[PDB]
Amino acid sequence: TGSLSFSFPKFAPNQPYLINQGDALVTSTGVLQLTNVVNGVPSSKSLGRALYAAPFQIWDSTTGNVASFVTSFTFIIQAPNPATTADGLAFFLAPVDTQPLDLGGMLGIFKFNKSNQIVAVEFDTFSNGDWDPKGRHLGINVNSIESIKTVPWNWTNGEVANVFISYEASTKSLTASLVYPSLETSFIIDAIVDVKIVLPEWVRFGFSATTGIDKGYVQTNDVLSWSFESNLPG
Amino acid sequence: TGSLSFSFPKFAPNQPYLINQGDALVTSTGVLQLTNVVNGVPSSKSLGRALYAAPFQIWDSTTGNVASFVTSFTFIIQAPNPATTADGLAFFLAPVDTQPLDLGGMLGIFKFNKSNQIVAVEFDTFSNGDWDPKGRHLGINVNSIESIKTVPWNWTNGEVANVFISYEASTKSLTASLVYPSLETSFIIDAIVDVKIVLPEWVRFGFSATTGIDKGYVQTNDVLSWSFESNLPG
Amino acid sequence: TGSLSFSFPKFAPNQPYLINQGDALVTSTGVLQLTNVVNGVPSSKSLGRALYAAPFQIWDSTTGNVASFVTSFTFIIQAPNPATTADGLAFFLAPVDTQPLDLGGMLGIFKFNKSNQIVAVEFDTFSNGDWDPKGRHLGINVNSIESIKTVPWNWTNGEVANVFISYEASTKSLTASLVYPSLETSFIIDAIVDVKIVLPEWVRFGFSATTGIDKGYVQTNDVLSWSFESNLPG
Amino acid sequence: TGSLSFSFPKFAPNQPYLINQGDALVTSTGVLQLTNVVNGVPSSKSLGRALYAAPFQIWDSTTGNVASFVTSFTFIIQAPNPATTADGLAFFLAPVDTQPLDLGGMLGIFKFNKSNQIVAVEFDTFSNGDWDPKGRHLGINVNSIESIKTVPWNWTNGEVANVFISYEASTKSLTASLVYPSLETSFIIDAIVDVKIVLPEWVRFGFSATTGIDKGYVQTNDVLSWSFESNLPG
Ligand SMILES: [Ca+2]
Ligand SMILES: [Ca+2]
Ligand SMILES: [Ca+2]
Ligand SMILES: [Ca+2]
């Protein structure tokens, strides 16, 4: 039982409230730069992740209760060539000792090890014909790179996107939405996810992002703000 | 400056935390029944509204700051004949002394009086060819029954719908989403709304709903739960 | 089950988030003036109370759970003659339809009617030899003007006092503290209070204050800010 | 700018939400055992500390704003010989890289290095004639083992104590209270503390405790629960 909440209007660099993995870094301007950028140009074969320093209890084995939570963040994905973007950015939950996995289409969160359980909401900028539908999309993933559900997403180059994710334990309902405030465009996806049967009691959480493996398929994956709130009923 | 938040898993009847208007009532089972139902069958020409007992400050004239808020609720709309549904349910903000207005397509919140300023998110179950696009839809309305924006909505008879509405003051961005947890279907709409130039400093808020005027065009408009949270920066 | 929280840095006049009773009023400067003041001088035989517009559920008969809550406020009591002060200011919980009671030493909250159940934390500025110990004191009262416990209080004329009250349901522990930030002085009291056996499921809450009945025994009873938070486990 | 809050009804062992230092450990029963205990008997010359995994921003150099926060916890101090208890338990704020300092009377938080800035609320069970008044007491400390203020404390062997600490940035007022719910006894202390001029922008926080250096002067220093909430205005 317990709760956790926080809010960061921007990110302060060199402060241990984030666990940076891979190429991830926080700029002097307060931006969480998940993937490498050289002179403004995003680099290929990059992978970066950022986890909140503390994990939270998503369910309790003694009471059997499951936590409900919400998280919101803003992010920007900018690409020199909007026709060739890859690979995506995702918010995810995983074991406390979670470490970066495969590059590219695996978004750094997938690579079946029953110890690498993971639930994620992905903003996929590149269609992987081997497991992706068609075109850019929002996706909800449980233990694999193949989403349990996807919805089309009209990505807008360099535009600030507001994301909201909520999980209602009582209905095991995970909802994810993306809105471009300046453009008044919006997208949403929902799926049933039984976190109690997927994840361990305690989990770390945050962001992961990768750029494409092939030349040209690059984009930035910058998070600008982040708030979170969870509550596990006693 | 200030804040307000609350959560009601269900509604207790005969308790002054709600201001009931029109035909609205709270059942012994804890359901907020906005429109009349006779022996399970919704009645026509019904109008009911429910406001939280206390208003909240949405903006401050001294500091010029604007509040950000979020609200979530679950509701059900059941109709004997799914081909003929009317008129809709809405969440709205208005002056503290707000009173029910016109029936039917006006959803009880519209009837131009600069004192009847109102912002609402509507779940419209009937297309009014005079100001509505086509088919059922989600809508964001500012001072008039004609929405500044609408998106198609696939209503599901008697199914529990989860709604989430958020307002980010910094971007004047109002977002509304509806999800059917059991069906994993979801809809969303977003629009720029400048509450500071539309509403007074203090506003009351809640639900309003109406049934059709013509025979047969009926439906229930029942709210099952409601949570709210606002924060006006100092 | 449910929750409620709010925060008011100051009080806006003519806004229905407060239910004013007796002589209570909100000044143009945002001060909650509980008792009458004429040209700066507090009047005798005055009684004023202020309740939050909405009640909250302090316990649930279905689950049997009890709510925990906290409230904080700042107040000032100024008197022309510091040797003759009366009668006091109190924070209290009572039935939703609660109305002002007796003047003077009864602090407007006492007058045994099993329907007038009340729990209060009092800041008593006048010793009533018939039921009060000796000198000014903090007190916790349950259903009567005679406190279940009192602690000495060194009141400071016109000084801003910060009050914090907390109720831990699990231990039925009610704690009340008063601090004068500028003076670094502090006082505290604690007592076991079984709200489930004292109050009804839903209660309204707020402030009550009275001035003395006899000439000279006067003081202002002004509240400057107020925050509240309750949570009733499901 | 930002915020952080959490609540732990008890402590789960082997979970990275706490940074354990010195002898500190979490029992299988969920108790945060700060100092060593051998077969129920507390050991001498022990020192243990526990910090929340993430730091929080207590003030911002860009806006100049200061955060307000509150924290509550329950703890027990049990000693074989109640006549000889040492040394104490404290809640403290310090630089993010804070490491345990001196044993015994220094409570593991003191040892003047302008980089070892620290603010703490101490529950001192042993009077150090060299810098302590007389008898057990509550104390507020800023950069040194000599408290800026102390108040007498009647410690009760093995009794659960509820602690509440609040910091109001606007008045630079730090308040600390201790109550024994079962005994209805209470103690409180308050002092002006200018955190902006004492601590760095970001700080880690938590508990520290030590047992006496001399034989016999021992006690347990067990924390049972902990909640925290901070808000740094933008
Ligand atoms: Ca892909
Ligand atoms: Ca319509
Ligand atoms: Ca009295
Ligand atoms: Ca000492």
Coordinates of C-alpha atoms and ligand atoms in Angstrom, one line a residue, chain B residues 124 126 128 132, ligand 2:
Chain B
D124 CA -24.5 14.8 -28.1
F126 CA -28.8 13.6 -31.6
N128 CA -29.6 19.0 -34.9
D132 CA -24.9 20.1 -35.5
Ligands
CA2 CA -27.7 17.9 -30.7

